[PDB]
Design a protein around this ligand. Sequence first.
Ligand code: HEM
Ligand code: HEM
Ligand code: HEM
Ligand SMILES: Cc1ncc2n1-c1ccc(Cl)cc1C(c1ccccc1F)=NC2
Ligand SMILES: Cc1ncc2n1-c1ccc(Cl)cc1C(c1ccccc1F)=NC2
Ligand SMILES: Cc1ncc2n1-c1ccc(Cl)cc1C(c1ccccc1F)=NC2
Lengths: 471, 469, 470
Amino acid sequence: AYLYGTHSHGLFKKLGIPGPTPLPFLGNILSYHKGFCMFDMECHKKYGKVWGFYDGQQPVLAITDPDMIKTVLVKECYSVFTNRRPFGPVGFMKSAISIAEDEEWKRLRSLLSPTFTSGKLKEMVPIIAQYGDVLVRNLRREAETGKPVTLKDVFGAYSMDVITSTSFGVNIDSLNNPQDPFVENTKKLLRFDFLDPFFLSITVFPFLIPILEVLNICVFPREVTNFLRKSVKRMKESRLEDTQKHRVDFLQLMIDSQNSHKALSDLELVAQSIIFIFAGYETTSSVLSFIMYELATHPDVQQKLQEEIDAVLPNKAPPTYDTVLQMEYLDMVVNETLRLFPIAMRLERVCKKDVEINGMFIPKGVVVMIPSYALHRDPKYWTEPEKFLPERFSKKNKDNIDPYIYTPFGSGPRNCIGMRFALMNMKLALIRVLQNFSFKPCKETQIPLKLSLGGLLQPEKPVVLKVESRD
Amino acid sequence: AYLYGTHSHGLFKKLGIPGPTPLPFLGNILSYHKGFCMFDMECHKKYGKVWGFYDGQQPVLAITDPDMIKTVLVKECYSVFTNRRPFGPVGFMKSAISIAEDEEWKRLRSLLSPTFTSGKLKEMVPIIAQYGDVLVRNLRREAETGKPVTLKDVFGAYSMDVITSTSFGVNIDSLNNPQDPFVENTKKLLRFDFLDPFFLSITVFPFLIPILEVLNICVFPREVTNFLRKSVKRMKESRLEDTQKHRVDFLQLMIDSQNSKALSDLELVAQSIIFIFAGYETTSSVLSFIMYELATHPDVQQKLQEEIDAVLPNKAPPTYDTVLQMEYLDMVVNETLRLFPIAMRLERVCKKDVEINGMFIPKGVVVMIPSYALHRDPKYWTEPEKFLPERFSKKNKDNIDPYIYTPFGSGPRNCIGMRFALMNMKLALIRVLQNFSFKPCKETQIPLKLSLGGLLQPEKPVVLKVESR
Amino acid sequence: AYLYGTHSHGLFKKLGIPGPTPLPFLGNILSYHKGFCMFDMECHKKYGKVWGFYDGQQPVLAITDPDMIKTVLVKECYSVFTNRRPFGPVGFMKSAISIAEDEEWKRLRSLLSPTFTSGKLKEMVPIIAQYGDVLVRNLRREAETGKPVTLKDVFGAYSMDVITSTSFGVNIDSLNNPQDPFVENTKKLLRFDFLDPFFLSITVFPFLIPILEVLNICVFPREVTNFLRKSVKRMKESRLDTQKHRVDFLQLMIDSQNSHKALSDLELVAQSIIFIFAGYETTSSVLSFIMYELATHPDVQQKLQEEIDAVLPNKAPPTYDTVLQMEYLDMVVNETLRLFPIAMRLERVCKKDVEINGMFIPKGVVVMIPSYALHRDPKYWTEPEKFLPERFSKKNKDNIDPYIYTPFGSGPRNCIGMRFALMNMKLALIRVLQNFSFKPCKETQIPLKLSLGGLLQPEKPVVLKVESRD
Ligand code: HEM
Ligand code: HEM
Ligand code: HEM
Ligand SMILES: Cc1ncc2n1-c1ccc(Cl)cc1C(c1ccccc1F)=NC2
Ligand SMILES: Cc1ncc2n1-c1ccc(Cl)cc1C(c1ccccc1F)=NC2
Ligand SMILES: Cc1ncc2n1-c1ccc(Cl)cc1C(c1ccccc1F)=NC2
């Protein structure tokens, strides 16, 4: 992207922007020993408002100023900062919203938009909540042996359960049969760190893109894609001549959208389905494990929230859309877990053409990066950043929060499209389990929690906790 | 090759298997700073019995259990653990047994194992004994004129000498005639770290193969091999066919087994080249190591400096069946091979998804047996950094596990010329100290630091004072 | 190049040559954390007269013996050490003299040589001197405040001005007319570290060249050079109007085309481009370093100031002969270039197995002369860390070995632009020092830290306090 892949390491010196000294070829990849999080944290304090670094040959400029951020994510979204890091030849996956660029993306965003509206989310709630009953079901069985529960298993399965049932309408008990046709293939597909900036080695060695295109050597081969392409083949047609309708999954919502910009294709439809899995599986599972960790080790908050839930759903009353949005304190806790642990942890935009944003020149082909994780813990926005304090998100405390500093779902036209859905999904899980159980740490518990080194935040060791069937 | 060459640095943490945390793209190669062995060492002593690491993008799973190693090298060798690391486009050398994969490997390994019967190694010992007497004759060079002697020079030239006549039927003194186009061309050939996992850039950039293949970039050009190929083509076309000065060497044996589906001529030269790579620096290295151990541990040297004349007194031609006799020497060798397994590692590519013993191994992963770190594993050897030859002699040593001591590996895909290299070295070793003796020079390295590279070797070349007899 | 791009790390241990122990793939790249200079320095002390290391897969043999250096750079230049590192698909820039190899380079060097004579320099001086005036004006404005001056802003501007005027025969004020299309576009071109060994992943990924050649993937695309190329096509056809004819590098190269085979039209543009790479950052950097050295050594500065006044009294304008007269000026330039050779090192690929002065060198290896290290080697220089213009006095003539001291290389493939580069720097030097005095301020970087890259540069731009005179 940047300078046709040529040596770039003198760029931030020309531009007069501080940053770590690069090695030839590698740039600052060695600086990644502490991980993305600690790297960005270190750099922020050391270099200040703004700093450049090099992922191999790819220059990355990090911005912290809220007005600079707004310019990148919002004002100049469509004009200059429309895309993310460039991707390899992934075949038809090219037309997945997350890999789509420029006009293609723009079209695809506009088509996928009405699928994620609040109104149509309300209609999925029945299907999600039923796996909130399935979650507690499988989670009670461990609370009677009184043993350690690995939460990235019980939530992994829940994330999986919701995805399969909302993405394809395929209904499964994941924890109890991992040999189910779908689950094994989904988890196989899920092996690929598709959206990681180190998925291939484009950063170091950028020529990899043009070479692989021209040789049509595909790095996401038909073999991987086939199973779900056939499931969607036999799905579109088969169960959908029922007349009786019913279907409320993502598939149907997209199927329904194909008639009277514009016109979503079959292969396109499929690519959104796949991309939804990548977006939702490990992310949702992780936020859940992160939430329970904070709750289990803060028993005050747990009970306080635990009584707020019983106060609006008396008698473990089944959760409903309207009464989910009812719960302020539940919302304060999700937002705070995500403040500490923004699973993306970094937001990125390639700069399409030379530009001057709030005073600063940015050359074409650069990656403009917003360090979410670092900014979420920036003392110059939050008092006691390292401390988990659901209190910051009380409405007596909403103006103080800057939407361009708190960015767990990004911002602007290219933010998270399934934010509403991610938030609704996780809350229905939380509500159900918290109603029926209290969660407590034991010595088997990684305390304090260590983090994933890589690009996508995750507990370093699986979150393990002891569960009591309760009041 | 693993997960379509794609980012893989999530496996070992997603399988509970510990190991050093990898850098993006590099994986763990920064850890190679210590060398292959010293890495396997600190990893063993840290993560315990099983650990993974990443060679660039290539996920490498190291196993220490004898049962594991047995399932790998022996049980599942035909079905799961058939091949080593994939190779780049190498032309006709795809036929070399070391490069060949699956059943296509098997056909070859079949056509070959006859050639390595002890009933054929036997009739070979004359042609190689020739060089023992060439080695010692050379070696009296600077033993007599009085000066520190660097042993690699005379051991290198020796190992070179055996291979030439045994792989190609050509007797040369490589040290005295160093401009012989043969010695010239095979040393040109031995520049290539061919069997090294880092020969090319596969590990860190696994997309290299399909690219080099399609574009027909040759990594090992016909030029390199032209002189050997079109030499065999003269030793084997016009041949020793019209005449019958019937010689006993690897070349003729293969030639003969073409007149018994079969083996082609280029399939033939393919094997000869391989025997050089397999034979040359390994045979040299072990000798140097053995000589380090004796010179510095003088009591064991004399203990068979004329227990060597108790069998053949004195200065007798070491005929095959007199060399299998010396069981103490036999296991003096074994101890250097313990202390120094040249391979350092054993490696197999898991051809497809399986769970063996209690452990799951997904397709495309390298299962690696760290031969070195076992040979110095205190859990199996009292005083592991010892040089104590007879921890290996008698039915005293039914405790030697053929999975923990495997400096030639095990199962179908172990060292096919084990018996040859062992015979080669032993026979060489007799006709050196039965004429000389060695003292730690005023320049020798103690303790012996090794080479960081993929083929085990002394850091500095070994230097010893050599004496009269 | 080397052994078909195959693994090469075993070589130097084998040849009996010492050096830092490589890593798989990366060779000794991690040692560049120091930068080229400090790496060469520590290797020099640690390893001795000759050492070897690996730029990824690329073996590099470093040599220090003058006899050995004379052999590589001069004697076996045409036979064995004719080229630098290989390049890969760059389009019409293949015929750029710095990129050409073998027979093509010999032809280009021969065709360009008459352009770089001292005579043609003499007639160029009047043109390139009108930019010292612009320099003095530009600088004054920054000094007219009292705020510290980042020299790079004023020397960068100056270096730019001269090159685009000489190489493309135009007259612009890049500091004041930054949106002049020549300025924009020469700045575009200057983004590429064109001649840097790490321009591409070639050192670490040696198959890149053949892969890119067969697949016609261009690294220097042609939108990068379009404006400037098309400029030459509209500029030469306008001068021949056979009446007026400037003496710049463009004219001299058009002159050469008329009445061994003559310079092509695309070859002409190729050169003009390469002269920008060769002249822009180098001149800027050397000018900065000199000023750093004058401002920290006030005694030398003033001594130089009185020479300049005694030959050009009352701020007289420089001329070819009056520049060459200034002995101390020459010593000062030489001494800075000794401490700060911009190239940091000279390289030549070994085309063919040779024994040079008794040491075997295989085909494919880069032989490298560690210029930065040799300029600071105690064996040849007393207190090599000290700035001492006197090393280059007349009295101190042939204590300077011309294979030790190589700010401009040596032999047939040395700097073709040397005489010019020196004239150019001295011209500007004269004018700034006729008008100004330069003192450190709080913001100067003492001690000086050097760039880590392949083209020597101050790490922080040189900031100084600048006073007027009169
Ligand atoms: C589980 C918690 C989740 C978090 C923390 C999360 C966070 C994010 C973030 C930070 C981005 C990047 C936004 C930007 O660059 O400005 C993003 C993008 C995206 N997310 Fe999510 N997400 C989550 C779940 C989901 C789910 C369940 C879906 C739907 C299946 C989804 C669909 C997407 C899509 C499609 C994009 C790309 C938008 C585009 O390029 O047009 N996310 N998400
Ligand atoms: C000190 C001397 C030698 C040692 C320590 C040695 C050791 C080894 C080891 C450890 C292996 C791999 C075992 C495995 O992965 O299962 C091997 C493979 C091999 N060795 Fe040797 N070797 C030596 C000399 C020789 C000689 C002289 C030859 C023949 C001229 C030879 C031919 C081979 C071949 C052909 C293979 C692989 C064949 C196949 O994959 O089927 N080796 N050796
Ligand atoms: C003070 C500034 C300069 C310095 C220190 C400098 C130094 C050098 C050095 C060290 C080399 C390599 C010589 C070798 O390998 O032996 C070189 C080559 C070269 N320089 Fe310069 N140079 C400078 C300015 C210029 C200018 C202004 C031009 C032309 C306008 C120029 C044109 C070249 C060319 C064309 C080559 C390559 C010669 C060939 O391959 O035939 N240089 N220079
Ligand atoms: C889906 C999707 N499409 C585009 C994005 N994403 C995305 C969604 C959620 C999260 Cl937590 C990260 C990303 C990521 C992401 C960042 C680093 C590593 C892996 C990722 F998926 N990038 C933006
Ligand atoms: C022949 C052959 N084919 C496959 C192997 N080998 C092999 C044979 C003998 C030796 Cl002494 C090492 C190796 C090696 C080896 C390992 C690392 C670096 C160089 C090697 F030759 N072995 C695996
Ligand atoms: C123009 C040109 N053509 C060929 C050369 N050069 C050159 C000229 C001047 C300078 Cl100071 C360096 C070089 C360089 C050079 C070396 C390392 C990094 C950048 C360079 F321009 N090398 C030899």
